[PDB]
Amino acid sequence: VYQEPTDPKFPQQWYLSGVTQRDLNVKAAWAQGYTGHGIVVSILDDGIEKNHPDLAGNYDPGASFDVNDQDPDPQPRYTQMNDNRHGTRCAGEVAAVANNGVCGVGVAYNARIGGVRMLDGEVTDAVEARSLGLNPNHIHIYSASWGPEDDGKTVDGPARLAEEAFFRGVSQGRGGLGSIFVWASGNGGREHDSCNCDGYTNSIYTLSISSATQFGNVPWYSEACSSTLATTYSSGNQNEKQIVTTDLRQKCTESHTGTSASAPLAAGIIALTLEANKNLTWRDMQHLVVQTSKPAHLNANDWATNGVGRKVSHSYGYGLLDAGAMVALAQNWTTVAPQRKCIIDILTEPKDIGKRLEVRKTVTACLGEPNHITRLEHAQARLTLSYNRRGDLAIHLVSPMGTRSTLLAARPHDYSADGFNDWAFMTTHSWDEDPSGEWVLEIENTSEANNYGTLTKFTLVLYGTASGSLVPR
Amino acid sequence: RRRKR
Ligand SMILES: [Ca+2]
Ligand SMILES: [Ca+2]
Ligand SMILES: [Ca+2]
Ligand SMILES: [Cl-]
Ligand code: NA
Ligand code: NA
Ligand code: NA
């Protein structure tokens, strides 16, 4: 009979388990025997307190490096303001030691945990690449609670070295099964930011994770976008509980918050899932998340049923992670077929945007070719356009099965006249749909201003397979 | 910074 942790703050970890059902169903995974043994997670952040009483037992120097100072030791830099506490808080969410009379427990409290010290310094492209590419045959899962500025006017993503690190990781990492990159979708909610303007979250190679409050609401900091895949609990208003984890200076905190707390909880759940089936590929893991995540009782005004009967929201992706369901489905999972890529250049001429532009195109999705896709995974609309005030644009993409993805919502602070230069807006909302048929792109001016610009390129990029479908939900 | 926590 499984015995739950006795740690002093475990009763305050409301998001791990409870009678109430407002949790991530993590105790159910523990009771199936999965606690993370043998899985290696690295926190890419501002360092990790490797001697913390709730981390030392799980600490893994092979999962760690200091990119900022170019040494093996990721110890945080101690300051009066405790600026470099962030990575230690994230690490405890994944892998804080259980049943040791200290603080609470990690989701994967028997996993090995490391940290890359890379945020405490200039975060260049090379710095990101060296962190994302660290020991990729030892580290299984990388967790990143950072990214481009959430001011609601930035469009930015991985530069060349970092993107090369993503492709090398998913292609050759973890013995060719592919590194698992987990990303926090962003804190730009107050600025009406869109997490599709962040190339890290918008990447197909990352599992972008959003947040829900204890009472099941969209937190103030949350960013909505179509690239988000799923959700874990985090902080909300001051009547709602927060996240319990290891803090800097060997302390315990019950007030870890924001998007930063959601990605590590997802990384811990993915660690449990990898223990249940170490042969899962990076794409397998995303399929598992899509199939098992739970919308129920998460409040949003945009819940929609996609072409295969799954509920999807721009605030939550496919909903809350469910650790018990993840580890159960993982055990007899059949590896997905190799990923196909079908490139469809849509436009035959540039199109003036004006007040509203609609582009309709019927595609065959590479019918008759080895990259024929009947089972969609990610879809991208790679757009090149000029516009005088970027944040007045709203962009939607409708799949042949009728699923409307918001690629870009209005961003009031985005005054840029720089437009989009082949920006690969991504949606997860048509996962498992047949992409043959009519796709519709809509670009509209959401303001009364007399704005102007031109769409000069629209590449529809479809990823997926041609086999293995389930009967729709 | 180019990237934020
Ligand atoms: Ca160091
Ligand atoms: Ca503990
Ligand atoms: Ca953002
Ligand atoms: Cl590709
Ligand atoms: Na591979
Ligand atoms: Na992503
Ligand atoms: Na069709």
Query: How far does A121 lie from chain B, in Å, by closest CA?
Result: 8
Number of other CB atoms surrounding residue A70 within 10 Å: 8
Strands A453-465 and A375-387, by their bridges, are antiparallel
Name residue A359's amino acid: V
Query: A334 burial class (0-12, 13-18, 19+ CB within 10 angstroms)?
Result: exposed
Name residue A154's amino acid: T
The tokens describing A98, both together, are 């259980």
Q: Which residues contact A423 (CB under 8 A, 6 or more apart)?
A: A155, A382, A383, A384
- What residues of A are labeled active site? 45, 86, 260
| Of the candidates A225, A180, A230, A231, the residue with the CA atom closest to the CA atom of residue A205 | A180
Residue A200's closest chain B neighbor by CA? B3
The tokens describing A136, both together, are 């990729």
Distance, CA A140 to ligand 2 centroid (Å)? 23
Distance, CA A199 to ligand 3 centroid (Å)? 9
Q: Taken in order A363, A368, A374, A379, is the CA torsion positive or negative?
A: negative
Distance from C-alpha of A386 to C-alpha of A421, rounded to nearest angstrom: 8
Query: How far does B2 lie from chain A, in Å, by closest CA?
Result: 6
Whether A44 and A133 have beta carbons less than 8 Å apart is answered as: no
Query: A403 burial class (0-12, 13-18, 19+ CB within 10 angstroms)?
Result: buried
Whether A382 and A459 have beta carbons less than 8 Å apart is answered as: yes
Buried b (16+ CB within 10 A) or exposed e, A363-393: bebbeeeeebbbbbbbbbbbbbbbbbbbbbb
Which letter does DSSP use for residue B3 in this model? S
Q: Which residues contact A440 (CB under 8 A, 6 or more apart)?
A: A358, A359, A360, A396, A397, A398
Ion ligand 2, residues whose Cβ is below 5 A away = A 7, 54, 97, 100, 102-103
Distance, CA A145 to ligand 6 centroid (Å)? 13
Q: How was this structure determined?
A: X-ray
**Residue A22 φ then ψ, to 5°:** -80, 65
| Of the candidates A130, A144, A398, the residue with the CA atom closest to the CA atom of residue A260 | A144
Phi-psi map region of A456: left, alpha, beta (phi>0 left; psi -120 to 50 alpha): alpha
Query: How far does A363 lie from chain B, in Å, by closest CA?
Result: 38
| Of the candidates A459, A470, A400, the residue with the CA atom closest to the CA atom of residue A426 | A459
**Residue A282 φ then ψ, to 5°:** -60, -35
| Of the candidates A118, A122, A100, the residue with the CA atom closest to the CA atom of residue A110 | A100
Asked whether residue A235 is marked as a ligand-binding residue, the answer is no
The separation between the first and the last C-alpha atoms of chain B, rounded to the nearest angstrom, is 10
The position carrying tokens 């999965």 is A34
Q: A54 vs A8, A31, A46, A90, A275, CA distance in Å?
A: 12, 22, 18, 12, 21
HSE toward the beta carbon, residue A73, CA cutoff 13 A? 4
Distance, CA A391 to ligand 1 centroid (Å)? 41
The position carrying tokens 């101690």 is A78
Domain ranges of chain A: 7-331, 334-465
Please tell me whether residue B4 adopts helix, strand or coil conformation. strand
The tokens describing A286, both together, are 């995303």
Which letter does DSSP use for residue B2 in this model? -
| Of the candidates A211, A219, A371, A232, the residue with the CA atom closest to the CA atom of residue A289 | A232
Closest by Cβ to B5, choosing from A46, A124, A148 = A46
Asked whether residue A193 is marked as a ligand-binding residue, the answer is yes
Resolution (A): 1.9
Asked whether residue A102 is marked as a ligand-binding residue, the answer is yes
The position carrying tokens 């992409």 is A435
Beta carbons of B4 and A149 less than 8 Å apart: yes
Q: At what angle do helices A259-276 and A86-95 cross, to 10 degrees?
A: 30
Which H, E and C letters describe chain A, residue by residue?
Answer: CCCCCCCCCHHHCCCCCCCCCCCCCHHHHHHCCCCCCCCEEEEEEECCCCCCCCCHHHECHHHCEECCCCECCCCCCCCCCCHHHHHHHHHHHHHCCCCCCCCCCCCCCCCEEEEEECCCCCCCHHHHHHHHCCCCCCCCEEEECCECCCCCCCCECCCHHHHHHHHHHHHHCHHHCCCEEEEECCCHHHHCCEHHHECCCCCCCEEEEEEECCCCCCCCCCCECCCCCEEEECCCCCCCCCEEEEECCCEEEEEECCHHHHHHHHHHHHHHHHHHCCCCCHHHHHHHHHHHCECCCCCCCCCEECCCCCEEECCCECCECCHHHHHHHHHCCCCCCCCEEEEEECCCCCEECCCEEEEEEEECCCCCCCCCCCEEEEEEEEEEEEECCHHHEEEEEECCCCCEEEEECCCCCCCCCCCEEEEEEEECCCCCCCCCEEEEEEEEECCCCCCCEEEEEEEEEEEEECCCCCCCC
**Residue A281 φ then ψ, to 5°:** -85, 170
Query: How far does A130 lie from chain B, in Å, by closest CA?
Result: 15
Question: Per CATH, which fold does A334-465 belong to?
Answer: Jelly Rolls (2.60.120)
Ion ligand 1, residues whose Cβ is below 5 A away = A 66, 69, 71, 73
Whether A212 and A189 have beta carbons less than 8 Å apart is answered as: no
Task: Tell me the residues of chain B between 1 and 5 that have a Cβ less than 8 Å away from chain A.
Answer: 1-5
Beta carbons of A128 and B3 less than 8 Å apart: yes
Q: At what angle do helices A125-132 and A160-172 cross, to 10 degrees?
A: 10
Q: A46 vs A7, A79, A96, A200, CA distance in Å?
A: 26, 12, 18, 18
- Residue of A83, A149, A155, A198 to mutate for B, most B C-beta atoms under 10 A: A149
Superfamily for domain range A7-331: Peptidase S8/S53 domain (3.40.50.200)
